[PDB]
């Protein structure tokens, strides 16, 4: 089950719907894909068969 959503995840008593920074965080996170890194951070293109 895929899930495409950019709504803010709240981690506190105060509700967040469009505010982030103090206890509410944007759910996506970007890889820092560089060729300077070693073996444990390289971008592996993974294809699966079901």
């Amino acid at each position: 089950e895929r899930d495409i959503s950019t709504e803010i995840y709240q981690a506190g008593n105060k509700p967040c719907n469009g505010v982030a920074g103090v206890n509410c965080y944007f759910p996506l996170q970007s890889y820092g894909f560089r060729p300077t890194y070693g073996v444990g951070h390289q971008p592996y293109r993974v294809v699966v068969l079901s």
């Epitope: 950019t6 803010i8 469009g18 505010v19 982030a20 920074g21 944007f26 996506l28 970007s30």
Partner: antibody, heavy 126, light 109 residues
Framework: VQLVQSGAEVKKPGASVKVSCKAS????????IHWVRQAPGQGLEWMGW????????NYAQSFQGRVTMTRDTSITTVYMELSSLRSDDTAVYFC????????????????????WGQGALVTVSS | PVLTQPPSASGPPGQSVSISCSGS????????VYWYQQLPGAAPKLLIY???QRPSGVPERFFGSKSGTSASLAISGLRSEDEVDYYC???????????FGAGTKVTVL
Amino acid sequence: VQLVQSGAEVKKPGASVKVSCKASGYIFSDYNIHWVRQAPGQGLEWMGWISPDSDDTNYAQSFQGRVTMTRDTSITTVYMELSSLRSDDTAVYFCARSVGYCSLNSCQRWMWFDTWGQGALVTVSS
Amino acid sequence: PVLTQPPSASGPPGQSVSISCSGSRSNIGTNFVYWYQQLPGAAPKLLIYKNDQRPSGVPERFFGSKSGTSASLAISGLRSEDEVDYYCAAWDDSLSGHVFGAGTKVTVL
């Protein structure tokens, strides 16, 4: 590194002006460029980006057909033509390089224009 | 869309001054905000990225932060470099691109 660009001069309204930006030193297959103008009496305004390694092109929500953007990978230069120049466009156009790489719409949160280049003032009059 | 900025903010040397930059619900509050300064007759550079950090070659007196849907920048020590203008660069979804502030002029008393 240096990101020198070539300016133009005064010209009649409604024609096409070509501005070019040249890159050197760094590898021109990993970094996006951005095109922002600066007019006297106001601040910066953003137009769009292209990519050196692909045919991606994105436009602002106000300039959909007034500007078309061109890539020259072999010469390591990037070109912009402006179509149907208005009167309130006498500005200084800046070739700006941002670190990283984005093509998607939602990617643009992490980009900042790191290595700017010197701009040139182009004008509209009669 | 665009952001509201004071046209002119000034402060005497020896202490600090603060520059505000408000935003809408989906302009600052979901996206990062960056601070740009430019010399007169020159090209702009980068001062604050990811709302807290600084690049190498920038002194430690330039600090900025945000709490809710607005951000503030504070500079301490105004001798010859803080007379330049500052811009509040961010990103939103309505214009689908980078949006900039009107422009803040900083002077000394």
